[PDB]
């Protein structure tokens, strides 16, 4: 027939890695460091580098078992290899931060089970296998819980107690993938935050990179340069926070995401000219792109301030998440966020007042604090906006009644 | 091959509209009013009518931008048009209920982004775009939050703070659609009630109409005349409440749903002979169909009363929803519902008692109030049903212990 | 084309039944009893047997209506038949445990609606029909709620107030099924525990058996012998608890699951040589297989004890479920479970201490009770593990601070 064709399911990958066929490739490049693998026919070597030299010294390994998957954190180095006709699939952990004399452990998966993806969390490690199993391990080598995956894994990321799994929930058509996300919190109270929700992607695009921001919010990038971030303040939906194609000059130009930071806001990525991944040598330079939510009429003052407001809102939801889970957060960052947002609301209200859009001013005042609304009332008494001042006063009464 | 064939995904639509190819078509017909579009080669006009003349005067617009999507509420008129080679896709709002002198605003979507569906809520508006984005706007023109859709939108509806999105979650086979529902509450505490649950449809049918009842419960109709309603009292499942094919006399006869009302119960729709949608002229007459849940042996007294009981139960769940969300509800309606249900239970218990089904009587008494159970005990002492009276007494003891 | 092919959706089935084409087949074989159907051209008979003769006497029925689906519980016998050109699809219940003189009821489904699956709960019965409807009935014959199914049903099971539905959520490819699970609790507070989550299956396998353990935990088996159980302590994920292929000697050997028991742990199944289901005559013998979670390096002492620990953890989650839902549970079973787990942790800590893996000892002590940690501190003071004793002491301080 001549209709829709099933899209081939994309293969699993480690975020921040370059393809396996390269002689000198990146196994992982994140906010902790870089892991490179030089593999020809004579020898196979793995080199580990840390951005902060104080964390650990540079580590060089002789890749005898031919490790093809790697992840790096401030605690350990995680390595994995598939099975051969003689050896089993192995998970290798270099626990360099351990305070004891045993800084290494390795485990063999059962017969005919191959590791397809790994990720490192805070004090734990996870491995998705060809048996549609997810195996949890402590950073010291204890086997934790095991559960089955609803489909073949695509990529896996970890941060703190959070586990971020993207897998094939179905079969897409006409170039589209059919991906689902399983988001778990592996603390003392186990929670499945997302029960295989559909992962939004740009049409005819595939998954290019997943992970967490340094502050601990799940994020991912598709092959069309669209960067999306979990919106905890919007029912755990996914909000686009950047479009790396706006910084590209041609079709063959791409950006290779390395890390995401919310405070200060910066998207650390490698500019790539001619391909989607940078060559290992010479050392590529990390670029810093700004985040921009895809808002309408962003060239106008209204659209510009509206984008700044909602970007400030979503990039400070992590403070509430750190508070709800007992983590440590700076109360000063929370206060600066509110002041930054109340200033943008006040400037947007003054703009709507100049445009004789007084109903819009009351809508903006609904997002304001009680102090900001009281200030907007006196600004409305000024400039002879008498009815607007009355509507704002009635809004201030309603806000005080909500307490 | 000769097997299952992929079903073509149905295109987005506005509920209560007639096809675009008509010279004189309905853009939207709901419980607020009617919006018609007359478009030939000479001129293009849009006419707005309100069922209640006291709400607003009849509005006539010169459709210069060729708006093809429309929605209507007691607050504003929402219009949208796709992009051309010279103009961008635009969202136009006629805020006629505004108390200020600015009763109009329009916004341009970014390049190559087209509006595919719109809907109006209480004080807000939403637009699903070709970029798989959902854009939220206040009724006054402020851009609110934005998040990505898991698939191409099919239809969109709003009521109060609720957002009702139906989209393609996959690809169906053999005439079946693969639809998912995302139900959000956009109040001060954002909630995603349904994380893309599968939307039940009749086999080989497509989505024909979605929306909310006047009381605020999500409902939808498929192409086979099956009307389904969210059952908040049954874990947010979907319960069939009507079958418009029972009122049709032939295959070519159809009913075109306009609105759904829970108190009093009535399904307002347009009878259509020969097609699925009514012609614009002459003005079609609104028919009132009754709701009937698809219960077994409904011709018998037992099945008839069982259908009346569960229809009364599901059509009063909205009272609990209005109470939990601080909305205003009549306590008298809640009391009349319970009295209506306790009377049906009492008549079903008397029927089971006549049939010497005393175990069934105790099952019916489990659904009764403590006062109704006490009354059933004295009715069981009467007519010499001594063991039944003892079982009902032990049930009354258990009910008092649950407090 | 030459690519992925759509997998034909498997047909609905009753768990514990043998195919319909057999002259003498099992309609259901569970922990309550056996129901056999002998059907040739001369006569059609249904025989009911109870494992405990004290429950009820053996029942013999003349299958005049040609019932093809059956389920059995300690309360009633449930039978169902499809519709013919003269008769409707019927649901027949033999309420043998009733304390009244009416121990039978039957109901007719509407025109062109056929029963596809049934299941028995505590005091209720459910039937999934060809109209994509789920109909609830009390054990005495009262019609309860009705809601629509997101797809064609595959199998259905019930236990207490829990309803376990597996259905087709999509179309799989290359031999894979696309199954979803809807898990409901039908008590006085209706809950949808699983909103159509994807059902994990072994690749290229189909669903072979579903049901609940005697303690009330959902479980299911695929065609590759993998037995999975709901992990309530792991965010309602699914954990493999057995692999019946490890007990098979050849490809043609299979195990036919009958029941699952958590305390004592035993998987009751019928060994089958040459086919997937046992012949009705002679009476097959019920085998008892042990549960084994698929852990790595299970031949070693570490892997063996780690498997025993997590098997003990998951097979005692039902005690917490019985407690949260007011059911009756033995506090002695909960105490024996903790003692069994603290002993395994203590032996694993002593093993890690012998291997000079002191960081791993602290990880194991995190899973210990406060008394077990205090004991591990004195064991660390012994054998001159001074730093380990300090780390365990700081862990004991942190545990006391969590109260």
Author numbering:
A (entry chain A), B (entry chain A), C (entry chain A): 421 to 823
Excerpt from the paper describing this PDB structure:
To investigate further the structural basis for the interaction of AND-1 with Pol α, we determined the crystal structure of amino acids 329–826 of human AND-1, comprising its SepB domain, which correspond to the region of Ctf4 (Ctf4CTD) that we had previously characterized. Despite the low sequence identity (17%, based on structure superposition), the AND-1 SepB structure bears a remarkable resemblance to that of yeast Ctf4CTD, with the same tertiary structure comprising a six-bladed β-propeller fused to a C-terminal bundle of five α-helices, and an RMSD value of 1.8 Å over 305 Cα positions. In the AND-1 structure, the trimeric arrangement of protomers seen for Ctf4 arises from crystallographic symmetry, and it was confirmed by size-exclusion chromatography multi-angle laser light scattering measurements. Indeed, inspection of the putative binding site for its client proteins, based on structural homology with the Ctf4CTD structure, highlights a solvent-exposed hydrophobic patch formed by M766, A770, A792, L795 and Y799. The pulldown experiments showed a clear interaction of Pol α148–171 with AND-1336–826, which was not observed for the double alanine mutant. Together, these findings indicate that AND-1336–826 is a structural and oligomeric analogue of Ctf4CTD, and that it interacts with its client protein Pol α using the same molecular mechanism. The resulting dissociation constant of 39 µM showed that the interaction of AND-1 with Pol α CIP is surprisingly weak, and prompted us to ask whether other regions of AND-1 and Pol α/primase contribute to their reciprocal association. Crystals of AND-1 329–826 were grown at 9 mg ml−1 using the hanging-drop vapour diffusion technique, in 0.1 MHEPES pH 7.0, 1.1 M di-sodium malonate and 0.5% (v/v) Jeffamine ED-2003, supplemented with 0.36–0.42 M sulfobetaine NDSB-195. The protein crystallized in the cubic space group F 4 3 2 with unit cell dimensions of a = b = c = 249.72 Å and one AND-1 protomer per asymmetric unit.
